[PDB]
């Protein structure tokens, strides 16, 4: 209206002086992450599994197997998760580190109760299931991962590649993840255990996705992320996902860790990355601003992914003209509704980089589009208020 | 205007009562799929090929080779297509089931008239082209697929891996798809046919995409989707696509099905998934509502992909104020133009899951954006009508 230190933009008349404004934007502050109000938020994979990480649960560590509660919203904290100690593993030679983050994307996750393969009847038999006391079970003694069976032949000879088929062994509509691997040691020890001293070749096919691996015999890297025990050998661990009703095929040679108890999961869980522990309660979970409580319809700052009762990002501080018409369209602007953005829940940081880059490009473009729409709406509203 | 049981929304004044409205939305009902009006719609791959499926045509079945008519709009009916019966195939060990759906995305599809490789001059010669009476040709007798040549060596010895190059053998600008595979049987039969009883290793490279395969000798899964004949062995079949002017490389051992007649195709065909048979005529093809005839500019319901003279999805039942200005605003809203959304036509369901998930995410985001724009337009229009 008349002269005043408050200015508001209009779609047609541009800048104009008004005798009071109602701010609609606020810049938040980075804060810790809190439990989402009204939804059970997944932090640690198994909260009641003590002294175990997500990779320990995913690989089935002997002393921390337990039920994984279902969750609709989940938090990603470790981009490169680590183990808390069992038989040493070459983590970087495969894609195994992303398995906990893959299971994090499924709402319902459970471990099978029956073995999908009878390890004593697999080709290359007779087998004896060896074990090592690197990671022990409930009673102090030798153990191994619950999702594998270290098969050591009773007859010590070299073999040609052998084939085994992994069937679908749980309810339809649940994608099944099969975890397998192979074990290698130095020359004399492999000559004593398997009867041959040459590298062995492994491969696996599932849904048209094929991988190939060759073992190493000799100098090994120093043990890392394991319960400190002097051991001369170490294992390579991989996983393959099978969809509904689809079987898998594995070709192998001496030193195979045959799968025993597979993970198969269903549903979809909203995944956003953050940090632990979850402290308190928050209306919205912002990927860069931590746990935020919604107080105003819009916010200004660094745009990022969010889950929950969140405000909508804008690029400039918007103001609504002031001084029942003002209240009539104040709720209308506050009642705008936009769908939220999350990770793809199936695109891994290590494996799928171009897809994630395209995803962030789409996120930025949508942010700009909705910001422009909101600015146009605010100009229309306050232009109507002024007139 | 005055008091009335009809209410309309406005961008500025909010809810307002008017004496009559013009509905702009309608909820369709699920119906069968109909031929698209004005465009030749592709259903079956070869409609005049009787007693044959899409995979039978793609693999080149002896008794139903025929011309594939060109089409701009195509229908996908089998997510996991099956064969109607020839020599048994290990369907799930490769990506072969998606070949008909890959050919479905090309407007012009044809089979070559000359062999891209002279099978009798390939490395490992002398060869004799073996054949089996599992699927016969026009006159009852032994035959085989038109896109392969089962090369059985005349000299029965084991061989080291051999290399052959697949040249570009059709018009430039047409992507060429090469179909190849290998054959395996049990121990004594392979010792009698090929001279060796060890698994054979195969690989192929094209455009930097490489696959590796190892054959199986011994227990085979039960025959499925074949013309019932007792066969002790079965084959694995794969395909590789070469772009314009690019050759391919194949490494192989005993038991190779060398390519003979490749598919090369050009153009782009709009692919939407549905069900057969096509009954009648429809203005628009909705992926979930079947064949729909456009009657109103907008519709409310489950948003999905559509091809043709289709209405635009909205989330709420919009209404237009009533009671020549009204007529002018009705045509303007009815003449809005939005381009339609289809499948990627190159992303396979079995192989590319993250890309399809990102595609559906983009689909939903565009649906929300367009719905918001349409709602804003309707509020502006009826606000102008009231004033």
């Amino acid at each position: 209206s008349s002269n005043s230190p408050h200015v508001v933009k209009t779609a047609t008349q541009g800048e104009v002086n008004v005798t009071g404004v109602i701010p609609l934007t606020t810049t938040p502050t980075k804060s810790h992450f809190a439990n989402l109000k009204g939804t059970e938020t997944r932090g640690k994979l198994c909260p009641k599994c003590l002294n175990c990480t997500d990779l320990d649960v995913a690989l089935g560590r002997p002393k921390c197997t337990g039920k994984i509660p279902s969750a609709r919203v989940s938090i990603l904290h470790e981009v490169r998760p680590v183990t808390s100690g069992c038989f040493p593993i070459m983590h970087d030679r495969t894609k195994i580190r992303q398995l906990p983050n893959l299971l994090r994307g499924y709402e319902h996750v459970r471990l099978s109760t029956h073995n999908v393969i009878n390890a004593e009847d697999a080709p290359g038999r007779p087998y004896e299931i060896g074990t090592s006391g690197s990671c022990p079970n409930i009673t102090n003694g030798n153990g191994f991962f619950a999702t594998m069976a270290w098969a050591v032949p009773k007859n010590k000879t070299a073999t040609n590649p052998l084939t085994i088929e992994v069937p679908y062994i749980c309810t339809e509509g649940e994608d099944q993840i099969t975890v397998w691997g192979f074990h290698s040691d130095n020359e004399t020890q492999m000559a004593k255990l398997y009867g041959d001293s040459k590298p062995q070749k492994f491969t696996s096919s599932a849904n048209g996705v094929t991988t190939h691996y060759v073992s190493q015999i000799g100098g090994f890297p120093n043990q890392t992320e394991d319960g400190g025990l002097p051991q001369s050998g170490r294992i390579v661990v991989d996983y393959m996902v099978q969809k509904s009703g689809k079987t898998g095929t594995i070709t192998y040679q001496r030193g195979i860790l045959l799968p025993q108890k597979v993970w198969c999961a269903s549903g979809r869980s909203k995944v956003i990355k953050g940090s632990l522990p979850l402290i308190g309660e928050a209306d919205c979970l912002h990927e860069k601003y931590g746990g935020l409580n919604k107080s105003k319809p819009y916010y200004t700052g660094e745009h990022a992914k969010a889950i929950g009762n969140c405000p909508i990002w804008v690029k400039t501080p918007l103001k609504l003209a002031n001084g029942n018409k003002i209240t009539k369209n104040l709720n209308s602007l506050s009642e705008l509704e936009v769908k939220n953005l999350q990770r793809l829940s199936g695109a891994m940081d290590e494996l799928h980089n171009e897809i994630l880059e395209l995803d962030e490009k789409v996120d930025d473009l949508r942010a700009d589009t909705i910001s422009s729409q909101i600015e146009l709406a605010v100009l229309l509203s306050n232009e109507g208020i002024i007139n | 205007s005055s008091n009335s049981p009809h209410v309309v929304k406005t961008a500025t004044q909010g809810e307002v009562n008017v004496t009559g409205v013009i509905p702009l939305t309608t909820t369709p009902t699920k119906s069968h799929f109909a031929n698209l009006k004005g465009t030749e719609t592709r259903g079956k791959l070869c409609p005049k090929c009787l007693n044959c499926t899409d995979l039978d045509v793609a693999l080149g079945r002896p008794k139903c080779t025929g011309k594939i008519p060109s089409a701009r709009v195509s229908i996908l009916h089998e997510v996991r297509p099956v064969t109607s019966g020839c020599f048994p195939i290990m369907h799930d060990r490769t990506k072969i089931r998606q070949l008909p759906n890959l050919l479905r995305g090309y407007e012009h599809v044809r089979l070559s008239t000359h062999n891209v490789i002279n099978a009798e001059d390939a490395p490992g010669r002398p060869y004799e082209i073996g054949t089996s009476g599992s699927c016969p040709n026009i006159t009852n007798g032994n035959g085989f697929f038109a896109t392969m040549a089962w090369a059985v060596p005349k000299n029965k010895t084991a061989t080291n891996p051999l290399t052959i190059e697949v040249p570009y053998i059709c018009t430039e600008g047409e992507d060429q798809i090469t179909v190849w595979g290998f054959h395996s049987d049990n121990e004594t039969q392979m010792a009698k046919l090929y001279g060796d009883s060890k698994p054979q290793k195969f690989t192929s490279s094209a455009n930097g995409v490489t696959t590796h395969y190892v054959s199986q000798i011994g227990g085979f899964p039960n025959q499925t989707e074949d013309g019932g004949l007792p066969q002790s062995g079965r084959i694995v079949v794969d395909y590789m696509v070469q772009k314009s002017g690019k050759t391919g490389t194949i490494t192989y051992q005993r038991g190779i099905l060398l390519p003979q007649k490749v598919w090369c195709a050009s153009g782009r065909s709009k692919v939407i998934k549905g069900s057969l048979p096509l009954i009648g005529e429809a203005d628009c093809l909705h992926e979930k509502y079947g064949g729909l005839n456009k009657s109103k500019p907008y519709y409310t319901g489950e948003h999905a992909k559509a091809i043709g003279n289709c209405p635009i999805w909205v989330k709420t039942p919009l209404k237009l104020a009533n009671g020549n200005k009204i007529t002018k605003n009705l045509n303007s809203l009815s003449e809005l133009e939005v381009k339609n959304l289809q499948r990627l036509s190159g992303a396979m369901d079995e192989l590319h899951n993250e890309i399809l998930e990102l595609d559906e995410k983009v689909d939903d985001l565009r649906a929300d954006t367009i719905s918001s724009q349409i709602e804003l337009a309707v509020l502006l229009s009826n606000e102008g009508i009231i004033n």
Partner: nanobody, 124 residues
Framework: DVQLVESGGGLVQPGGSLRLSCAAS???????VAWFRQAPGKEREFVAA????????IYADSVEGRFTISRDNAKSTVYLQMNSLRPEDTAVYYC??????????????????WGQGTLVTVSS
């Protein structure tokens, strides 16, 4: 988690009235609640929906000017008032809700929390 329980079903002559009820505990200021129905031999279809915060109503064409939906956050219950029932309305009704706004107000994948169901029969 939230709890959804439906009550008020029964048998009514065609031309009368009926009211349904649904008690929800644990809803937040951004939730949405909807009613469904499934005729025998058919799939569930959208009937109505209201917003837990502002109370905006979305009613399907088949049942409009006759049905109505409302909520009372003081009593934590949502009602469905039925007028001029016809024998084509006989079905099993359901109460559905979600925590925050989803892709659309129609369909079953948009809503996450589902109620057990009540039986409504219309006959002369």
């Amino acid at each position: 988690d939230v709890q959804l329980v439906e009550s008020g079903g029964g048998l009514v002559q065609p031309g009368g009235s009926l009211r349904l009820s649904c008690a929800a505990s644990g809803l937040v200021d951004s939730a949405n609640v909807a009613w469904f129905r499934q005729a025998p031999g058919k799939e569930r279809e959208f009937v109505a929906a209201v917003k837990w915060r502002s109370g905006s109503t979305i009613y399907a064409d088949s049942v409009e000017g006759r049905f109505t939906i409302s909520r009372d956050n003081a009593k934590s219950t949502v009602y469905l008032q039925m007028n001029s029932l016809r024998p084509e309305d006989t079905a099993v009704y359901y109460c559905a809700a979600n925590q925050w706004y989803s892709g659309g107000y129609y369909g079953e994948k948009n809503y996450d929390y589902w109620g057990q169901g009540t039986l409504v029969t219309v006959s002369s």
